[PDB]
Design an enzyme around this catalytic site. Structure first.
Site, PDB file in Angstrom:
ATOM      1  N   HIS A  32      -0.390   1.117  -3.535  1.00 44.20           N
ATOM      2  CA  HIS A  32      -1.482   1.661  -3.674  1.00 44.20           C
ATOM      3  C   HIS A  32      -1.710   2.675  -4.704  1.00 44.20           C
ATOM      4  CE1 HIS A  32      -5.728   3.594  -2.783  1.00 44.20           C
ATOM      5  NE2 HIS A  32      -5.941   2.297  -2.325  1.00 44.20           N
ATOM      6  N   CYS A  65       1.061  -1.151  -0.006  1.00 50.47           N
ATOM      7  CA  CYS A  65       0.055   0.087   0.214  1.00 50.47           C
ATOM      8  C   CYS A  65       0.793   1.303   0.028  1.00 50.47           C
ATOM      9  CB  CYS A  65      -1.137  -0.257   1.060  1.00 50.47           C
ATOM     10  SG  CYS A  65      -2.320   1.112   1.309  1.00 50.47           S
TER      11      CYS A  65
END
EC number: 3.1.2.-
Lengths: 186, 186
Positions: B124, B104
């Protein structure tokens, strides 16, 4: 804001605890993680230690809740199934026509407490026989099953689906879709 | 047994912490959840509070580790990026040709600490521009990316894929498959 009670017992599946808590908070639901045993930290099934927001006793006083959530894990679910306090909360929630959501072995606590008989339910495959003892429910292999106010699901890998189903039931499809997009689900 | 160090900072994405910890423990990996700030409980991004196994200082003494894992969450990753102790651990791991896995916003701590330049990485979507500042990596949209000893992934919804990729890298494809089956992944 809607309110959710997540009941956290020793031996709970920590993925099935954290994924619903986090996704519900992303949806703007006010979530209380309540320790079955008290306010002390809880040792989950794979040894993650989580500090509950409250004892269940205190969290009950702060009800009612729009959903009561039961994580899985075999030993967590057994602890939920043995608890008179859990029985009372689930009976109350059922009586007030509130949602109950349970995942993996979690649904077996519905059986223990005589909740939602006659519902279609799913469980983890390994928890099927326990759940089905007596034929009080109809079994489903759907990843998430929802029969009115009884919402069930199967395992760690269905936890996002389960959590988003809770969000949809409480806050509607559009909020669920908006919460889902940043998660990078397949 | 293989060993994993999971570095847990305030503001970490708790799903991206718990899913890898639990799945690695299912794989028989000895996982240490190490608190960046000390042994005290850590308030994650969605307010789940996790008690680390150890301080990072103590966990370092107990190395080396077969993998160092960096969860995401914007603020958790910023805390990892600001930490001299994290810098030292990642440099050591890189120098000894050990795996580093980040998810992420987590990969942005690799940039901060100058780790793995020239690798293909994912993040992400919202962390892409931060990661790509300076063009030190090549970006990927794969849900999990692995370029040698740098293993990256995108979001909460890629966490199981990420964790299983770590298990495969450490313990092989067959163990990963055996760990995967009971999870009820789609």
């Amino acid at each position: 804001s809607k309110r959710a009670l997540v009941i956290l017992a020793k031996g709970a599946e920590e993925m099935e605890t954290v994924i619903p808590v986090n996704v519900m908070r992303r949806a703007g639901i006010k979530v209380t993680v309540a320790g079955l045993a008290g306010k002390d930290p809880v040792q989950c099934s794979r040894d993650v230690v989580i500090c509950p927001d409250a004892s269940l006793e205190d969290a009950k006083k702060e009800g009612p809740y729009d959903v009561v959530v039961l994580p899985g894990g075999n030993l967590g679910a057994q602890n939920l199934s043995e608890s008179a306090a859990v029985k009372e909360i689930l009976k109350e929630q059922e009586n007030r026509k509130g949602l109950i959501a349970a995942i993996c072995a979690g649904p077996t606590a519905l059986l223990a407490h005589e909740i939602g008989f006659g519902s279609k339910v799913t469980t983890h495959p390994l928890a099927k026989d326990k759940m089905m003892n007596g034929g009080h429910y109809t079994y489903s292999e759907n990843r998430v099953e929802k029969d009115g106010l009884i919402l069930t699901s199967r395992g760690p890998g269905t936890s996002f689906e389960f959590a988003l189903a809770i969000v949809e039931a409480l806050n509607g499809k559009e909020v669920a879709a908006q919460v889902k997009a940043p998660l990078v689900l397949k």
